Structures are given as structure tokens and as C-alpha cells.
Write a protein that binds this ligand. Structure first.
Ligand SMILES: *[C@@H]1O[C@H](CO)[C@@H](O[C@@H]2O[C@H](CO)[C@@H](O[C@@H]3O[C@H](CO[C@H]4O[C@H](CO)[C@@H](O)[C@H](O[C@H]5O[C@H](CO)[C@@H](O)[C@H](O)[C@@H]5O)[C@@H]4O)[C@@H](O)[C@H](O[C@H]4O[C@H](CO)[C@@H](O)[C@H](O)[C@@H]4O)[C@@H]3O)[C@H](O)[C@H]2NC(C)=O)[C@H](O)[C@H]1NC(C)=O
Ligand SMILES: CCCCCCCC/C=C/CCCCCCCC(=O)O[C@H](COC(=O)CCCCCCCCCCCCCCC)COP(=O)(O)OC[C@@H](O)CO
Ligand SMILES: CCCCCCCC/C=C\CCCCCCCC(=O)O[C@H](COC(=O)CCCCCCCCCCCCCCC)COP(=O)(O)OC[C@@H](O)CO
Ligand SMILES: CCCCCCCC(=O)OC[C@H](COP(=O)(O)O[C@@H]1[C@H](O)[C@H](O)[C@@H](OP(=O)(O)O)[C@H](OP(=O)(O)O)[C@H]1O)OC(=O)CCCCCCC
Ligand SMILES: *[C@@H]1O[C@H](CO)[C@@H](O[C@@H]2O[C@H](CO)[C@@H](O)[C@H](O)[C@H]2NC(C)=O)[C@H](O)[C@H]1NC(C)=O
Ligand SMILES: CC(C)CCC[C@@H](C)[C@H]1CC[C@H]2[C@@H]3CC=C4C[C@@H](O)CC[C@]4(C)[C@H]3CC[C@]12C
Ligand SMILES: CC(=O)[C@H]1CC[C@H]2[C@@H]3CC=C4C[C@@H](OS(=O)(=O)O)CC[C@]4(C)[C@H]3CC[C@]12C
Ligand SMILES: CCCCCCCCCC
Ligand SMILES: CCCCCC
Ligand SMILES: CCCCCC
Ligand SMILES: CCCCCC
Ligand SMILES: [Cl-]
Ligand SMILES: [Cl-]
Lengths: 304, 236, 166, 121, 63, 90, 103, 51
């Protein structure tokens, strides 16, 4: 996050009288006098921009009030619970406060009311896969080993966009499942063809399962996408298993030539009852699963 | 500063520290990662380090929640090291990190087990369907190899074999034996069949191919279950 | 199979030619044992020096350049892309000796060679920037792709005119 | 199942301590909070604590109640001081990351059974 | 500067057309050398006619 | 490569009606090649939430190869599946 | 400082997969000559795999422009796998009938 | 604090101890890879002052 973090405080020592009611000083004068030592509790490694010079200013008013604006780029920790990935939502905190001074020495306050103190520029939103719904501003206390400190916090609420993973993982998995399901329509005697379907589709599902977590942290628990991939893997594996089953029951190696007549019960293998049931069952079971999964997982997170 | 001369000097520090990991039992390993603290120049005759508050000096370890590891325990140690120039103080803050296995179950173990189970399916196909059985065996072999390659690239080039390498090598051996089983059956039928007809648990009858397939259908899952039991018991 | 003349240019920043005038010495640029350098693909050919006057908005500046001439060595690439591709083309040629009755075998061989050629094409351009023109390696890979595709196509015509047509 | 068991007194004339222990899930990274319900169906926020030990309070009980967490035992405690007769209510223990919340019951996906506390003068 | 593998560097469209036609002539004449092999199996006169046509087409392309 | 894989997939139309293994391989191999090309190309870009022009082209090629596989399955069902039934219906 | 490389990582990474893939190709001799698609699958899949191993072994190194020992090993292996395929083509050239021994 | 130490003896001898992490070049000949051996050098000396 890139911010114009700006603070103000009253220092009676710097009271003066002169022509102008406000003195706009260079960044050096800020280093010449006392200023707060505010830091970010969850920050990791930020930089105060100094191009072309330190992006700082100081405005001393006649009554002694100061105004010390900065231009910071803070990159901070945002702990996440990726149980509902890629359909999760987060609240990334931004917590800041004094480092040296306890409650009795320095206390922070919001200039305007808490809701309207933190303002986000409309045009400024570099999020790619996320959506910034809003922010909640609050204040509180932290009791550390040294003492008690005031911590002023702003939680930015983010929601992920599912669009990337619909084509990255979900659509390839569903197409692979339907590709395996297509094997039911071919004749039973074409053993190499249906074996090719089974092995190749389960290979593809294994590849997708491996590549699904190419970006996530190596979390121990299983995400929603992992459950979806597992069920797709189960469906393709069941298709290959039932092909093996029906092949076990095939009697005559030769297929049906284009000149013969099949008597009813050189005879020929009848079309499998297993295939007849599966053609309508397996797609229906996949449809019911997909509807249940999407209905369950779309509507889980809170609202306003 | 304090009235009685006490001075407190605090610093928010982010530091990268070397933790030499022995990955022999990886990913079922526990790792001792330590942070050493010493005075640079002053000997122990000039400065003495200690932990304020005793064993309760270090705080915040319980609040740490790593995505992969879990901090089993932490330990503080104080001692003096006889450095080359002289005797110096030493403090050590050590953690025993234990790796979580669920991620490796989801990524590595489950596809390998499923591919071995897939390779077993070639025993339920007739001996004469060479195309189908060879497709099964070959496809399983390449899937095992590409899984192995996709795995081991994301690690240092350690010279020894890990636990995950042991599991993947075992799965590869099982798949290779599954394919060599069909090779044996085909050789027995089409290579030794006409010669035999012209000229003329206990092991099965090598002459009957159907007997070999029925025997394999029972032996391969049993052997794989035994191998899994031995592996998991040994490494856990 | 390319060569380059990589420059290293320097000049005064603030002082124009009316204030500072750089100049070379009798033997200015010198190189030690070139065997210790980190030039992996490239081989150092020779160096030369040049002097010019560059006109910028602030004035004129004596800009002095050292050009190092480099020539890439095919070796690694000759092991990485040229040999593999040729084999897949030869591999594709092996299909002709297979009997025309073995339809699945010849079809599998053709598709496997075509996919392998596509994969090798993807691997070929992984070590360059995303230049939007054809390199010599790209030309070779493209020609090999035409070769394998023509092999599969002529097998297809043979099968159609032998079996399916009659 | 994830359970948030509660404990603490119910009758006081005073000082009290209400504890809440979680079982079935590690709430180290979750935000643990307490809520109040007086008779009238109006859930009131009391206090909350983060992974970073940062404490938030409601304006009605700022400095009277003190929230604390024990991460090793996976529990949250609330020390109540200066109990007044209007503080009689059912106190609930809740956990969950604060999404659109940290002061609203809608953001917490786990709740305790609740404990009645009554103040008699 | 200039290279056939990058048509942008070629100065003008006429240069591009000339380069393409000379390349086509090269493809044809090189094709004729390949056809020589057909003398093993095919009739001689027909393959002679094939090349006669190829070489005529190559001459036209060069023209 | 996408275009050329699609033309490769078209070859199955000319092969035969009974050469099941050949056409099945020639179909599914091209289908999965298209899928792998799509995912391997798009993993090098940011995790955008919308579909790009390259994505539209890749989905179109995928649809074409998938329809080639499906029409093979259709003719196989028509011959082997509906063959005896319709012949008896005569 | 004198240093020596430890070979175990590359024994597990490149050498042993190459040896097992070569042996996998050698398994093709034992099948009956009439199983043309099966033996073609063996040869072509082994040749493809041996390529992957070749293009995915150098990565560990820089882009040095001379052949390392591992490259020579991988080359000889590519020869054995490619040869096995060549003799299979030779065997199928002389095959007369298109049906295996019916039993 | 800067990992440096300067010690002065009554006779005037100075000891100057410094802690460093040096990223040095080891020009390799990877012709026997992965069965090679190297002798990585580390060389140091004065910059301005001569022999
Ligand atoms: C991670 O891995 C590291 C190692 O890499 C582990 O570190 C080791 O932890 C143990 C504790 O678990 C350390 O040993 C103990 O150290 C204390 C303090 O030692 C100092 O003070 C002593 C008291 O004055 C002094 O005696 C010590 O030096 C002498 O004695 C030791 C042997 O004890 C001898 O080796 C020396 O040469 C000296 O002669 C030292 O200055 C020490 O008090 C402990 O003593 C044990 O034994 C006595 C009886 O003899 C007993 O009374 C004690 O209760 C105790 O049982 C013990 O030596 C060890 O030093 C650490 N390693 C190093 C090299 O520093 C770390 O624990 C691992 N972490 C985890 C989480 O697993
Ligand atoms: C008979 C067999 C029956 C078997 C059963 C078959 C099962 C069929 C169901 C499948 C699952 C459907 C998943 C639905 C998930 C819901 C996803 C959704 O709502 O759609 C949009 C997201 O996708 C998007 O942008 C874009 C989605 C792209 C969808 C493209 C359609 C292609 C169809 C051709 C296939 C090509 C395959 C090629 C794959 C390689 C929403 O956008 P929105 O405004 O909210 O923005 C905000 C943010 O959501 C991102 O845009
Ligand atoms: C992946 C492998 C599978 C694919 C293989 C396909 C085989 C195809 C074969 C022949 C047709 C060649 C088509 C090549 C099309 C490649 C696409 C292409 O041409 O790129 C354009 C321009 O490139 C150019 O100038 C180059 C144009 C000339 C291309 C011709 C080169 C000769 C090809 C040799 C044929 C021999 C055949 C012999 C077989 C017997 C881009 O413009 P653009 O504005 O962005 O630039 C801006 C400017 O600043 C930089 O030039
Ligand atoms: C979806 C399945 C629901 C099963 C519950 C519903 C129960 C149910 O309907 O079973 C159907 C299935 C029929 O088997 P299937 O159609 O494949 O085999 C035919 C038939 O069963 C006889 O084997 C032969 O007739 P007959 O003996 O010579 O007279 C006939 O020979 P031919 O006519 O070709 O010459 C065979 O083609 O039964 C099972 O065999 C094992 C099923 C295990 C399925 C396990 C679950 C996948
Ligand atoms: C750098 O350039 C200068 C000027 O061209 C080179 O020195 C001249 O070399 C020529 C040829 O030997 C002599 O005739 C001139 O008298 C030289 N000029 C001076 C001032 O010495 C110089 O050798 C070049 N350095 C290189 C090539 O490294
Ligand atoms: C199929 C057979 C009969 C004919 C093959 C034609 C071959 C020889 C043709 C086709 C395309 C041609 C290349 C096209 C472009 C260039 C770039 C130019 O800067 C050097 C020549 C070079 C590299 C050509 C060499 C010859 C070439 C490779
Ligand atoms: C390029 C690749 O990725 C390779 C890797 C493994 C290969 C497959 C392995 C086995 C078979 C069986 C064969 O069935 S058949 O009876 O017609 O022989 C058809 C061909 C097919 C599907 C191969 C096609 C190409 C591959 C997918
Ligand atoms: C936005 C998701 C709407 C529900 C999709 C249900 C898909 C049903 C497929 C059969
Ligand atoms: C020679 C391989 C034998 C496989 C197990 C029957
Ligand atoms: C002929 C296009 C495919 C039809 C599938 C029902
Ligand atoms: C080197 C190829 C040998 C082929 C079989 C005799
Ligand atoms: Cl992103
Ligand atoms: Cl050119």
C-alpha cells in the first residue's frame, strides 16, 4: 500500500509571531526538531520515498501546531485462511503506533471521525485478482513487555475474483471429466481406444492436480479447489474402473462387422447394460455434484 | 533511561539466519533452527550476557503460526565459548520446527498411490490386448517419472536420498514390475507357447498365463500395502 | 550463429567539451587471461576504442566508447535443440518402414513426433527475449515441423487411397 | 466439531473472571472476542484480541473489562471489574477473522453457548 | 542491416517480393535435385517432365 | 501451434470408421495438447479475472478439436451402437 | 579451497532414470513381432522420454558451450533407445502375416 | 554494531579484526560434470600501496 501518511501535534516551544501565519519548511528542519516515531506493527520492509528529495514537508502554524506529511510504501503481512480458496475473503490489517512512548506519554487519535479519516483514491487500485470492498478504521491498545502502547488500525476488506481459476483449473478439470465420460459411447470391443481414454484422462487429471497449487502457500489443510480436483479425479478413475469391469465381461474378441444380423437373446456381443446405465448416470451424478458444490461454496462469506 | 542508572536499548530487527537442515527424513523431519548471540570484541571478563526474566525471557513464540511448520518447542541456552582470541559469552535461542505432512499427502503421495493403483488395472485385461496393457504400463511409467522431476526440482541438490525419494522409487519399482509382468506373460504365451506344444503363499504355475494374472491381482495390492505399512511405520 | 559488438560508453556528465576533453592513452584498454572470464556461450574476439562528440540539450560532450566483439558458440545449443529436433524428424522417417496395415502404430508415431516437435519449439525460444521475428533456430524448427507434418499427411493420403477408398 | 466452551460465575453482589476454551481448531490466527446480550435482543460488543495481542474495546466498558488470550492453551479470558446492576446479561464468546467487522456479530463464524451473569445490590 | 527472417528491415515491398520469388525458385530447383531420387523406381521420362516443369517454373520465378 | 494442432486433429476424418485406436489417439492427444498449450502460456501472466483474446482463440481451437473427437464418437455410436438395431428394424 | 562434487543427486536425477528408460526400451524385444502398435509405443515413448531427460539435465549447470560427461552418457542412451526402435522397424519389415499365433 | 575491532598494544602493535561475507569467483571447468573437482581461489592484497 502506498500512502500519504500525515500526522499533526502541538508543540508550544515552536510558537512564534511573524508576517505569515504558517511556515512551510524543508525536510531538513523536520530532522532538526522532535517528531513522532510512528511505525507499522505488521509492516515488513517499507521505504520512505526520497525522489528527487525526501517526500516530507513541515507546516508550523503560529499557535505551535505542526503538520508532518510523508509518502510511504508499506508492504505488510496479511494473514489468510485459505479454506475457501479461490472463493475466500480477507481483512488485511494496517496497524501503526509509537515505538518508544507508552500510553501515558503519547496517544494517537484520528483527525476526523474514524470512518472518514482514512481515504482511498478512486483511480488508485493496483489489485489484479482481488477486489477492495472497503475499509474499517479502529483504535486499541497493545500491552508489550516494555509497556502499554496505542495501536491505530485499519482493516482493508478484500474479496478474490474467481475468474482466473475458472479457466485455469475448473474448466480443464470439467472438460477432462467429460472427455473421460465420452468413452462410454464407444463400442465395448475397442479395448485399446477406451483404455487410451482412461489412462490419458487420469494422467491429465494428475497433471492438473499437481499444478493447481503452483502459487499458494504450502498450507497443510485442504482447500475447496482441492476437494473439487479430488472429486473430478474420482469420477475419471471410476470411469476407467467401470471400463475395466465391462471389459472383464466381454466374451467375443471380434467386433460387429457391417454385414451380419444380430439375433436376440456367428453371434456378437450385445451393447453393455453397464454402458447404457452409465451414459445417463455418470453425467447426471457429475451435474448434481457440481450444482451442490457451487451452491454450497458461492454463499459462505459475511456481508455488510 | 531510569533513575537508578538502568538503560533499555530496543531495536526492531528482521534477520535472516542460517539453519542447516538435514533432509534425510524430509518431509517427515524435525529441524533445530538456532539464533546465536555474542559480543564481538569484549571478552567474558568485560561483558556478561544473560536472559532477563529467566527461561521466560523470550516471548511471542506461541503466537507464531507458520503455514508449513509447527513450533514444537523453544529453548534458551547461555554459555561461554573459548574463541580463538579469548573467552566470549554466548546465548542461543533455538526452535524445533516440525513439518506438516498434509500438503505432501495432497501433492506427492496421493497421485503416486493412485498411479500405482492405475497400473494394477492392466492385470484385469486379457493377455492378447497388447496395445491396451502396454499403454497402461508405459503411461504409468512416464507419469511416475514426470511426477518425480516436477517434485525434486524445488529443493537443494542434496547428495543423499530422502524419504519422499524412497516412496517414489518404490512406486516406480512397483509400476515397472507391473509392466514387466505383462512382458513376462506375452513372452510365455507367444514365445514359449508353440515350443511347448511342439515339444509336448506358493508360487503360481508359470506355464498358464491366466494363472499368472490371477496371482498378480492378489500379490501386487498385498505387496504394496505391506510396503506402505513398512514405510509409514519406519518414518513415523 | 550471431555476433555482437557490445559497447561501453562514458563521458563527463556536467562539463561539456569546452571544459573537459577525455582522451585515450597509448594502450588504454587491456585484458588479462581471458580464460578466467564468465563468457559461457560467447567467445571474446577483440576490442576497439572510439571517440565522438554527442549533442544533448545541455550542450556538447566528448563521449568515448569501447566496443567488445563477441561471437556465440553453438555447442550447448547444438546439444539442446538442433540434435533433438533432427532425431524426431528421423524418428518420423521410421514410420515409413512400418507396414501400412498398422494404422494405430503409424498414427501414434506421427502424432508423437508432431507434439515432440511443438514441445522442442517451445523449449527453443526459452533462452531469448520475446523478439517478434524469426531466428535461425526458429527457421530450423519450423522446417523440421513441415517435414514431420508432411510425413503424417502423406501417410494419411496413402491410407485413404489404399484402404478407405478401396 | 469446533466447540467454544465457557465458564465463569453467574451471581455476584464486584469482580469476576469469565473464561472461554476452544476445542477442535487452533485459533492462534483468528480474532477472539466477547459479546454481551442484555434482555432486549441487542448484541453489544465488549472486547476483542488479535494474533498481535492488540486489544479493542467498546466505549461502554473501556477500562472496566480487560481481555486476554492464552495461545498455548487456546483460550480467551475476560476480567470484569466494577460490575454495575445494568451489566446483568448473557456473555457470549466468539471467534473468527474480522471481515466487514471486528465490532459486528456478522463477522464471527463461531460462537459459545453463552453464560448468564447477574448483579444484585 | 537487413535479413530475410525479419521483413521489417527490408527497405521496400519490391525488395520483399523479389526475395520471396528468388526463394521460391530456390525451393523449386532444390526440389528438382530431390526428385532425382525417383529415377530408382519411377519411369525416367515422366520424372524428366516433372523437372522440366519445375525448372521452367523456377526460371519464371527468377524472371 | 494451435492452428497446426487443429489441422492435425482434422486428419482423423480421413482415416476410417473402424480404426478406433488411431482416431481416438489422434483426437484426445490433440485435445490435451491444446489444453496444455493454454495453461502453460497463461501461467506466465498475472492472475487477471477476465478472458483475453489469446484465451478466446485457445478456447475456440479447443472447441474445434473437441468437436472432432465428439463426431468420431458419434459415428462410432451410429455404426456399432445403432447398427444392429436399425438393421433388425428393416 | 579444494572442492569435489557429490554424485548422488545426479545419480538419482538423470543417470538412473536414463538407465531404467533404456531397460524399458530393451523390454520391447520380448514381445511378439505382430504387436506392432505396442512395440511402436515402447520405442516412441522411450525416445520422447530420453529427450525430456536430455533437455532437463543441463538446467542444473550454466550454458557452457562444451559437452559434459553427463551429456555423453545421455547421448549413448539416446542411441540405444533409438537403435532398439530401428531394429523393431527392421523386424516389422520382414514380418509376413498380420495375425499372432491363435493358440 | 559495525563488526569491527581495533586493539592497540603499549609497544604500538595494532590488531584489526573484521567480520565479512565474501562472494568470490571460482572459475570452473565443467568438463567432467557431475564428477569434477575444483580449486576455488580467494586472493587479496593492497589496492593503492605497492610492494
Ligand atoms: C539445537 O541444537 C543445539 C546444539 O547445536 C542445542 O544446544 C545445546 O543445548 C544444551 C542444553 O539443552 C546445551 O548444554 C547445556 O548447557 C548448560 C549451560 O552451559 C554453560 O554453563 C555451564 C554451567 O557453568 C557450564 O558447565 C558449561 O560448560 C561446561 O560444561 C559443558 C558440559 O555441561 C562442557 O561441554 C564444557 O566444555 C564446559 O566444561 C557451559 O559454559 C549446562 O549447564 C548444561 O549442563 C548439563 O549437564 C550438567 C551436569 O554436567 C547438568 O547439571 C545440567 O542440568 C545439564 O544437564 C548443558 O551442558 C549445549 O551447550 C547446547 N549446544 C551448544 C554446542 O551450545 C539446542 O538445545 C538444540 N535445541 C533444541 C530445541 O533441541
Ligand atoms: C452434458 C455434460 C454435463 C456435465 C456437467 C457440466 C457442468 C457445467 C458447469 C460448470 C461449472 C460452471 C462454473 C460457474 C462458476 C461461476 C463463475 C461466474 O460466476 O462467472 C464469471 C467468472 O468467470 C469469468 O469471468 C469468465 C468465465 C469464462 C467461461 C468461458 C466459457 C467457455 C465455454 C466453452 C468451454 C471451453 C473449454 C476450454 C478450457 C481450456 C463471473 O463474472 P463476474 O461478473 O462475477 O466478475 C467477478 C468475478 O467473478 C470474476 O469475473
Ligand atoms: C512453432 C513452430 C510451428 C510453426 C511453423 C509454421 C511454419 C510456417 C512456414 C512458412 C510461413 C512462415 C510464417 C512466419 C510467420 C511468423 C510471424 C511473423 O511473420 O512476424 C511478423 C514479422 O515477422 C517477419 O518479419 C518475418 C516474415 C518472413 C517470414 C518468412 C521466413 C521464411 C520461412 C521459411 C519457410 C521455408 C519453407 C520450406 C519448406 C519446404 C510480426 O510482425 P510485427 O509487426 O509484429 O513486427 C514488427 C517489427 O518491428 C519487427 O519485425
Ligand atoms: C451401473 C451398473 C449397476 C449395477 C446394478 C444393476 C445390475 C445389472 O444390471 O448388472 C448388469 C451387468 C450386465 O453385464 P453386461 O451387460 O456387461 O454383460 C452381458 C451379460 O451380463 C452376460 O454376461 C451375457 O449374457 P449371457 O450370460 O450369455 O446370457 C452377455 O453376453 P452377450 O450378449 O454380449 O453375448 C454380456 O454382454 O451385470 C454384470 O455383469 C456386472 C455388473 C457389475 C457392475 C458394478 C458397478 C459398476
Ligand atoms: C585507443 O585509441 C587510440 C587512438 O586511436 C590508440 O592510440 C593510437 O594508436 C595508433 C595506432 O597504433 C597510433 O598511430 C596513434 O599514435 C595512437 N595514439 C596515441 C595518442 O597513442 C590506442 O592504441 C587505442 N587503444 C586501444 C585500441 O586499446
Ligand atoms: C524441401 C526442399 C526440397 C527444399 C528446402 C528449401 C530450403 C533449403 C530453404 C527454405 C527456407 C530457406 C532459408 C530462408 C531464409 C534464410 C535467411 C538468409 O539470411 C539466409 C538463407 C536462409 C537461411 C534460407 C536457406 C535455405 C532455406 C532453408
Ligand atoms: C506426446 C506425448 O505426450 C506422449 C506421451 C505418452 C504417449 C501416449 C502413450 C500411449 C498411447 C497408446 C496408443 O494406443 S494404440 O493402441 O494406438 O498404440 C495411442 C498413442 C498413445 C495415446 C500415446 C500418444 C502420445 C503420448 C501422449
Ligand atoms: C454462478 C454459478 C451459478 C450456478 C452454476 C450451476 C451449474 C450447474 C451445471 C449443471
Ligand atoms: C521377470 C519379471 C517378473 C515379474 C513378476 C512375475
Ligand atoms: C457432427 C458434430 C458432432 C455431433 C455430436 C452429437
Ligand atoms: C544399429 C542398428 C541395428 C539394427 C538391428 C540389426
Ligand atoms: Cl495478484
Ligand atoms: Cl536473412
Amino acid at each position: 500500500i502506498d500512502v500519504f501518511f500525515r500526522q499533526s501535534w502541538k508543540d508550544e516551544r515552536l510558537k512564534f509571531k511573524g508576517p505569515m501565519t504558517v511556515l512551510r519548511l524543508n525536510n531538513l528542519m523536520a530532522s532538526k526538531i522532535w517528531t513522532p516515531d510512528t511505525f507499522f506493527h505488521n509492516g515488513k520492509k517499507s521505504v520512505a520515498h526520497n525522489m528527487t528529495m525526501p517526500n516530507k514537508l513541515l507546516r508550523i502554524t503560529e499557535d505551535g501546531t505542526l503538520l508532518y506529511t510523508m509518502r510511504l510504501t508499506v508492504r505488510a503481512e496479511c494473514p489468510m485462511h485459505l479454506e475457501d480458496f479461490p472463493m475466500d475473503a480477507h481483512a488485511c490489517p494496517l496497524k501503526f503506533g509509537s515505538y518508544a512512548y507508552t500510553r501515558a506519554e503519547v496517544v494517537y487519535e484520528w483527525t476526523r471521525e474514524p470512518a472518514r479519516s482514512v481515504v482511498v483514491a478512486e483511480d488508485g487500485s493496483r489489485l489484479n485478482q482481488y477486489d477492495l470492498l472497503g475499509q474499517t478504521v479502529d483504535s486499541g491498545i497493545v500491552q508489550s513487555s516494555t509497556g502499554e502502547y496505542v495501536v491505530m488500525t485499519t482493516h482493508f476488506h478484500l474479496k478474490r475474483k474467481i475468474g482466473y481459476f475458472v479457466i485455469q483449473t475448473y474448466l480443464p478439470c470439467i472438460m477432462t471429466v467429460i472427455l473421460s465420460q465420452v468413452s462410454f459411447w464407444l463400442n465395448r470391443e475397442s479395448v485399446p481406444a477406451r483404455t487410451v481414454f482412461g489412462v490419458t484422462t487420469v494422467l491429465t487429471m494428475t497433471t492438473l492436480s499437481i499444478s493447481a497449487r503452483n502459487s499458494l502457500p504450502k498450507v497443510a489443510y485442504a482447500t475447496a479447489m482441492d476437494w473439487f480436483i479430488a472429486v473430478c479425479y474420482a469420477f475419471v478413475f471410476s470411469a476407467l474402473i467401470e471400463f475395466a469391469t465391462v471389459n472383464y465381461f466381454t466374451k467375443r474378441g471380434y467386433a460387429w462387422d457391417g454385414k451380419s444380423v444380430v439375433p436376440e437373446k456367428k453371434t456378437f456381443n450385445s451393447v453393455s447394460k453397464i454402458d447404457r446405465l452409465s451414459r445417463i448416470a455418470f453425467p447426471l451424478l457429475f451435474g448434481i455434484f457440481n450444482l451442490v458444490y457451487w451452491a454450497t461454496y458461492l454463499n459462505r462469506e459475511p456481508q455488510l | 533511561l531510569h533513575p537508578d542508572g538502568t538503560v533499555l536499548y530496543g531495536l526492531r530487527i528482521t534477520t535472516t539466519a542460517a539453519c542447516m537442515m538435514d533432509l534425510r527424513r524430509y518431509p517427515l523431519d524435525e529441524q533445530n533452527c538456532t539464533l546465536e548471540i555474542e559480543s564481538y570484541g569484549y571478552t567474558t571478563d568485560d561483558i556478561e550476557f544473560y536472559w532477563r526474566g529467566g527461561d521466560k525471557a523470550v516471548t511471542g513464540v506461541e503466537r507464531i503460526e507458520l503455514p508449513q511448520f509447527s513450533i514444537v518447542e523453544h529453548r534458551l541456552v547461555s554459555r561461554n565459548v573459548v574463541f580463538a582470541t579469548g573467552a566470549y559469552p554466548r546465548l542461543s535461542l533455538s526452535f524445533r520446527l516440525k513439518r506438516n505432512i498434509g500438503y505432501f499427502i495432497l501433492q506427492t503421495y496421493m497421485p503416486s498411490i493412485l498411479i500405482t493403483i492405475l497400473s494394477w488395472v492392466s492385470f484385469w485385461i486379457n493377455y492378447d490386448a497388447s496395445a491396451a496393457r502396454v499403454a497402461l504400463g508405459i503411461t504409468t511409467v512416464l507419469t511416475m517419472t514426470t511426477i518425480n522431476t516436477h517434485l525434486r526440482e524445488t529443493l537443494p541438490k542434496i547428495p543423499y536420498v530422502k524419504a519422499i525419494d524412497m516412496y517414489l522409487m518404490g512406486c516406480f519399482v512397483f509400476v515397472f514390475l507391473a509392466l514387466l509382468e505383462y512382458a513376462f506373460v506375452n513372452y510365455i504365451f507367444f514365445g514359449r507357447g508353440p515350443q511347448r506344444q511342439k515339444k509336448l503363499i506358493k508360487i503360481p504355475d508359470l506355464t498358464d498365463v491366466n494363472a499368472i494374472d490371477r496371482w498378480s491381482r492378489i500379490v501386487f495390492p498385498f505387496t504394496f500395502s505391506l510396503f506402505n505399512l513398512v514405510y509409514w511405520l519406519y518414518y513415523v | 550463429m550471431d555476433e555482437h559488438s557490445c559497447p561501453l560508453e562514458f563521458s563527463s556528465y556536467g562539463y561539456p567539451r569546452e571544459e573537459i576533453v577525455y582522451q585515450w592513452k597509448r594502450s588504454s584498454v587491456e585484458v588479462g587471461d581471458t580464460r578466467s572470464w564468465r563468457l559461457y556461450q560467447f567467445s571474446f574476439v577483440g576490442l576497439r576504442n572510439t571517440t565522438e562528440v554527442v549533442k544533448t540539450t545541455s550542450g556538447d560532450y566528448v563521449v568515448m566508447s569501447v566496443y567488445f566483439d563477441l561471437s556465440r558458440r553453438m555447442g550447448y545449443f547444438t546439444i539442446q535443440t538442433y540434435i533433438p529436433c533432427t532425431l524426431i524428424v528421423v524418428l518420423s522417417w521410421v514410420s515409413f518402414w512400418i507396414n501400412k496395415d498398422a494404422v494405430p502404430a503409424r498414427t501414434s508415431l506421427g502424432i508423437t513426433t508432431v507434439l515432440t516437435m511443438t514441445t522442442l519449439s517451445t523449449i527453443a525460444r526459452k533462452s531469448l527475449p520475446k523478439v517478434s521475428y524469426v531466428t535461425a533456430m526458429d527457421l530450423f524448427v519450423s522446417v523440421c515441423f513441415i517435414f514431420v507434418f508432411s510425413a503424417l499427411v502423406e501417410y494419411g493420403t496413402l491410407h485413404y487411397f489404399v484402404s478407405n477408398r478401396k | 466439531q469446533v466447540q467454544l466452551q465457557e465458564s465463569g460465575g453467574g451471581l455476584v453482589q464486584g469482580s469476576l473472571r469469565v473464561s472461554c476454551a476452544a476445542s477442535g481448531r487452533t485459533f492462534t490466527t483468528y480474532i477472539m472476542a466477547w459479546f454481551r446480550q442484555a434482555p432486549g435482543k441487542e448484541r453489544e460488543f465488549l472486547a476483542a484480541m488479535d494474533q498481535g495481542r492488540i486489544q479493542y474495546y467498546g466505549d461502554s466498558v473501556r477500562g472496566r473489562f480487560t481481555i486476554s488470550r492464552d495461545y498455548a492453551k487456546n483460550s480467551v479470558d475476560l476480567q470484569l471489574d466494577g460490575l454495575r446492576p445494568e451489566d446483568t446479561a448473557v456473555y457470549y464468546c466468539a471467534a473468527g477473522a474480522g471481515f466487514w467487522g471486528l465490532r459486528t456479530a456478522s463477522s464471527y463464524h463461531y460462537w459459545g453457548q453463552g453464560t448468564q451473569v447477574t448483579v444484585s445490590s | 542491416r537487413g535479413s530475410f527472417t525479419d521483413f521489417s528491415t527490408i527497405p521496400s515491398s519490391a525488395f520483399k517480393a523479389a526475395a520471396f520469388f528468388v526463394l521460391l525458385s530456390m525451393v523449386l530447383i532444390l526440389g528438382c535435385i530431390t526428385c532425382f531420387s525417383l529415377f530408382f523406381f519411377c519411369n525416367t521420362a515422366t520424372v524428366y517432365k516433372i523437372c522440366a516443369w519445375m525448372q521452367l517454373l523456377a526460371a519464371l520465378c527468377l524472371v
